[PDB]
Design a protein around this ligand. Sequence first.
Ligand SMILES: COc1ccccc1-n1c(=O)c2cnc(Nc3ccc(N4CCN(C)CC4)cc3)nc2n1-c1cccc(C(C)(C)O)n1
Length: 260
Amino acid sequence: SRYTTEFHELEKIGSGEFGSVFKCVKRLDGCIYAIKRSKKPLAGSVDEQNALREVYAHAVLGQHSHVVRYFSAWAEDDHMLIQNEYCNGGSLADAISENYRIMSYFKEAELKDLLLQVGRGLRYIHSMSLVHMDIKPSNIFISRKVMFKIGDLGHVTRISSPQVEEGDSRFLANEVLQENYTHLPKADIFALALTVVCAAGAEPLPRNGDQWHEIRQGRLPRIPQVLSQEFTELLKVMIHPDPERRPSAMALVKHSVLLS
Ligand SMILES: COc1ccccc1-n1c(=O)c2cnc(Nc3ccc(N4CCN(C)CC4)cc3)nc2n1-c1cccc(C(C)(C)O)n1
């Protein structure tokens, strides 16, 4: 087995329908990696389409400080293995749960740092004519200075010929639900604003109802902290009902509010 020959498992860090992810040490280089091992996808399934989107994204994207580094992928007896960089801080979703437990959240300066770093990753992905389509706290990984990195490329698609799989309804822009895929980079921007709102300590985002529609009308959810007006206006314009009004990732990373 290449997996057992080249690596030693150190800690299970993920489990679910996607299979299992372990923190491993590679024997040859002594470095730590995150390795996902999953069953061969069933033909015609969403799992198969996600695996195809991920292989394409891994071949197209280069190394970027704010995208989880991809190293290798191989098959072992009807199981697929993917070796990525290990981010020692876990996901932003788990960092948010830990903050909730200690009655805390990311303060304003930390939220602007998160928004800018994830924005730099999105600038790179979008510059490669791709969209992520699944930005959310569980797909942002942390390396600890703190570095935020986008992970889980399974929903990555091409702007020129988009194939949009089911997204997380809590982070889904209205125009994507309407099957309008002409401004997909702006669906990533909308999801990023809601990811930052989660990091700010908001209540669990709704999946439907009056509250889901209220957010899609351009109204930010409540957060248990006061943010500056320059920052709140940036979050509010990122969820505008008109995607053309939301900032591009290029505009977002040049914003003096985040840079300062
Ligand atoms: C090989 O990898 C991946 C392959 C596909 C998609 C995403 C990942 N993927 C990365 O690329 C990644 C990089 N770094 C980390 N670091 C980490 C450190 C600690 C923890 N903690 C430990 C302590 N526990 C109490 C809680 C969890 C969790 C993660 N994890 C990673 N991943 C990962 C891990 C779990 C789940 C998932 C998905 C598939 C998204 O569901 N992906």
